[PDB]
Design a protein around this ligand. Sequence first.
Ligand code: HEM
Ligand code: HEM
Ligand code: HEM
Ligand code: HEM
Lengths: 149, 149, 151, 151
Amino acid sequence: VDAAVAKVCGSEAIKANLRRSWGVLSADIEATGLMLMSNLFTLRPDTKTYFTRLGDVQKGKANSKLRGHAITLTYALNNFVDSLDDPSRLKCVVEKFAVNHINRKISGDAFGAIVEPMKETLKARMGNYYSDDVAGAWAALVGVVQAAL
Amino acid sequence: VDAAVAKVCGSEAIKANLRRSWGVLSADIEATGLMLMSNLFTLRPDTKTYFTRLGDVQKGKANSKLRGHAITLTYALNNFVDSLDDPSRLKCVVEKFAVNHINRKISGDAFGAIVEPMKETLKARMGNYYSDDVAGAWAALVGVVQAAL
Amino acid sequence: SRVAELANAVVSNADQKDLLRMSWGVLSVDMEGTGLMLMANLFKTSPSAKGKFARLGDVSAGKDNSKLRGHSITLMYALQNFVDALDDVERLKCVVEKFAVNHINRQISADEFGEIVGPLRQTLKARMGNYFDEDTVAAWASLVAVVQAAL
Amino acid sequence: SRVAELANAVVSNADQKDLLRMSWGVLSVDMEGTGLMLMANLFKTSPSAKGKFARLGDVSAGKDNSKLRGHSITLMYALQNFVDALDDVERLKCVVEKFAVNHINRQISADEFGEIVGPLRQTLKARMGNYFDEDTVAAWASLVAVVQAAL
Ligand code: HEM
Ligand code: HEM
Ligand code: HEM
Ligand code: HEM
């Protein structure tokens, strides 16, 4: 976990990419979360099995439990982005979110299912400002959680 | 104008204080504008007669013309703050803004009536995060507009 | 039915939204510090809360307790969530319902959930300074009450 | 006028609001560059517009023209204003009315103001790349139509 935290917090390029991409995503926090969850279930349909409390996750915004989840997820991303100045903050925030996923029996490999969904969400919502390094930055951040799982 | 721009943009401290205070004000752009105008007309009712198109300016949010004006004014502040890393941008934005005020017979001395109203707005909205350096920063930024009038 | 009534009332009350957003401008300058302060105030005024927060360990350690820091920061994003839901009733309702589910799972009653208001008041006073007002407390309490209707 | 009707229709249309915010997230990355692009496109497809903007001088000179630069940036903050008004009908109405007065004072009519839609499309193709979709243009056209109604 410490090594993974340092990879993120110690890289100005990763921090700048997370911040500029978050700038775009924050134009519509709710829509970002719903699009990310849609891409999760589309690009990784195997993950649907974990989210049955939410009912028909394919219904998007109309499914209120999915909507509430998607919004909360997006504030978790907001939290990560606001944790970049303090490796100890990023660590404890990651550890908190890891506790939740460990208790839902989500492995590091399973959690990594988000990476391609996130990449596609970034492409769709950033347009020509997308770059592969932006996806890499978010993959590195996900890697911190994976190390904690 | 160039020298007044440089007093602001050349000062790390002024830029930091503009940015942090703007962060607070941006929690409610509309309320910021309405409060600034309320403070202008309360502290400086002499300025009311410059505003001949907006109806009864003391009616605040209920007056739609005042409301539209107050909101739009706050985006001018947003634009100034977003211009701080590029002196040439702050210059051209302030010059445009100055034309708007010259068209309404506003001198530099008249425009300076906003300084004490701005200080009160900052104090009220920032709570214990206010400091006098914040007021200093905004007075310097107002000075750029005064130099352009 | 009751959650809907209270959520519709929050979305319909413009003056209350002004108070929430103004105070949010000060509460969110230092999300981590404000969260820790809010939690400290909760533990001060509710002895029972320490027990409900047993996972967090020695909460008296404040910022030096990593689990408490992680929690306290997340709590502040939950308040941001509320602030961002004030213009959309279905949004506010789904946010509230999710909060209610979480607290039900941790055996938090409506009466226990209401223990946050005093702590918020004290935190608001610490942050709003010479511009604190009582009406801002009631504004936050309205949000708390929507969740209480769901618990 | 149809301003109230069209403002209400935009605020209540979640589908369109989503498209406006998503594309605005891209358009607003580079406020100056995108503003200058919109204006460059306007002058290319509506050469008649050039005379209306004579205060700005050489409207073909892009970023090298300081007045065009200040104008184009300020235009983008008017769009930010509209975007931030999409959850409040009376807010949207009053800011639309404000900018309508600015344009009325330059004898800019509704159909003249409509000449921005092509430029918005070209700018969206440049900014969205392979993710461009015409449905977003229609969303912007609907918002533009609220201002047109006020002219
Ligand atoms: C960047 C990636 C992710 C972040 C930041 C994240 C964050 C969260 C957050 C904040 C919650 C809600 C906790 C609460 O109740 O307040 C949550 C719930 C959940 N997450 Fe994730 N998550 C991510 C990826 C995933 C992935 C890839 C999976 C599965 C493969 C997963 C499985 C779950 C499950 C099963 C729940 C519980 C849903 C429920 O029943 O309410 N998460 N996650
Ligand atoms: C921080 C200070 C100020 C800012 C950011 C500001 C910004 C603005 C903006 C953006 C407009 C709209 C311009 C247009 O659309 O033509 C405006 C209009 C105006 N301003 Fe200011 N202003 C400020 C201080 C003042 C002061 C101190 C006065 C008078 C002493 C003043 C007098 C006016 C007048 C008369 C109008 C025209 C209102 C109308 O009918 O639309 N401004 N201001
Ligand atoms: C405005 C009021 C409140 C909000 C918005 C709120 C929100 C939250 C959030 C977002 C979490 C994290 C959920 C998770 O990750 O599973 C949480 C955890 C928790 N909350 Fe609250 N909460 C509030 C008031 C309270 C009060 C007054 C109590 C008890 C007196 C309480 C007891 C708990 C407990 C026991 C946890 C689990 C802590 C842990 O072990 O991680 N909450 N709350
Ligand atoms: C999204 C579409 C548009 C927005 C948001 C917009 C916004 C603005 C703003 C904020 C100003 C500055 C107003 C002032 O300071 O008085 C402006 C000036 C102007 N606009 Fe627009 N505008 C738009 C489309 C157009 C179109 C299509 C035309 C004409 C074909 C037009 C003609 C003008 C003219 C002539 C001025 C005055 C320029 C000057 O001399 O400074 N606008 N516009």
